[PDB]
Design a protein around this ligand. Sequence first.
Ligand SMILES: Nc1nc2c(ncn2[C@@H]2O[C@H](COP(=O)(O)OP(=O)(O)NP(=O)(O)O)[C@@H](O)[C@H]2O)c(=O)[nH]1
Ligand SMILES: [Cl-]
Ligand SMILES: [Cl-]
Ligand SMILES: [Mg+2]
Lengths: 245, 170
Amino acid sequence: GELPIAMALANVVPCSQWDELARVLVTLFDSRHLLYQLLWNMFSKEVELADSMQTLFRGNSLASKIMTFCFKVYGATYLQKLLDPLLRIVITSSDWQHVSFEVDPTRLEPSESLEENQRNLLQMTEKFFHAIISSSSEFPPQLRSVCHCLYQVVSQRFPQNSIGAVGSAMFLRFINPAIVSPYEAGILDKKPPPRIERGLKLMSKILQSIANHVLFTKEEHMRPFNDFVKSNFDAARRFFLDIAS
Amino acid sequence: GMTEYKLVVVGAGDVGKSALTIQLIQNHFVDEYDPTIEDSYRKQVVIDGETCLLDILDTAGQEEYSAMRDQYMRTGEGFLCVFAINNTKSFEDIHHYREQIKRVKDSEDVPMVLVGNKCDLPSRTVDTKQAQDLARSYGIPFIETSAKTRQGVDDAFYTLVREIRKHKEK
Ligand SMILES: Nc1nc2c(ncn2[C@@H]2O[C@H](COP(=O)(O)OP(=O)(O)NP(=O)(O)O)[C@@H](O)[C@H]2O)c(=O)[nH]1
Ligand SMILES: [Cl-]
Ligand SMILES: [Cl-]
Ligand SMILES: [Mg+2]
């Protein structure tokens, strides 16, 4: 019926129009209560073709476009309720000692202390990380099924990377874009001050490192956070397992 | 002494922006899954007999992070515009990056270099002539690279530095 028609026509849309294709596909099949079946087929098509996890969802990936659309339309209420109280705390903090997150030594003011800013950044990252992994009871049910469907499909072929795939997707395509740009995400009514934006971006880099199970090896100034990253791998996996199994 | 150049590497996801940068900065090629939010590097090199300090910003190709483009386009002085020769959409995206850079800087004279990466692959959907015509239309250099073999990597970065320096010496 509807699924083979949609699969065949999806080939015809050039990748430049895939944002619109993902919207229309999800909208069409959700209104027919067939969203799980759409995701199973779209995910399986790509997963069955890949020979390794490193080559899955790379480049133009209609499955990836569909997933980021689902996060946006099914996860807005959850995201706003989760991040807004946290962002309001860091935005209204009165500690001017605890007000800088600059941890790149080449950008550091002589007035500020690198080790203090590192600790400041780590404390914010801990509050955000702990809130995220404590939020499973509030996760939207339709988004839970999106993540479970991805987990089940990937597990048929790459069982040892199926939970990492959910975890990476949820931070990369859902949580971290909103932390980095909370105003444009519609969570805040005002863009945060630049010192705060700097901290939000650096924290999101640490959260993504935890979510992806990769240590910092590129930027020199990020490696000091590798011990914090390692210490949170297991809690992150337990959270992803709760959401995806 | 030493002149400082603010380079920004832009382009679609998975075209190899980070792989190109890491060859220059760390002299190896990594084949791993590691999408960028935003990474910052510095390197001292000698270009045309003058010591130069490179400030390199490696940006996000994933479209969910598009809100942070305005900031880095304001601060960058030259842009490495990277597409992958087997990704037609990434080639078409070059026009969108260029027009946003021109708006944010309010200029039609912004130093930039067109880079077609992954030229080690026999899977090509963007012809060299197509890319040369686009670069010629824009009036900028076009360089084919492979981050995997390091072909063309240094030339891409050095050419952007030379375009920036030309712009600063006007
Ligand atoms: N064959 C080949 N593969 C390459 C080349 N450059 C990068 N790749 C591969 O293509 C993938 C994407 O590389 P990456 O450098 O992460 O690209 P990116 O543009 O930085 N991604 P993002 O925008 O998400 O941060 C990786 O698997 C990488 O190994 C190249 O010149 N040749
Ligand atoms: Cl296999
Ligand atoms: Cl596996
Ligand atoms: Mg990258």
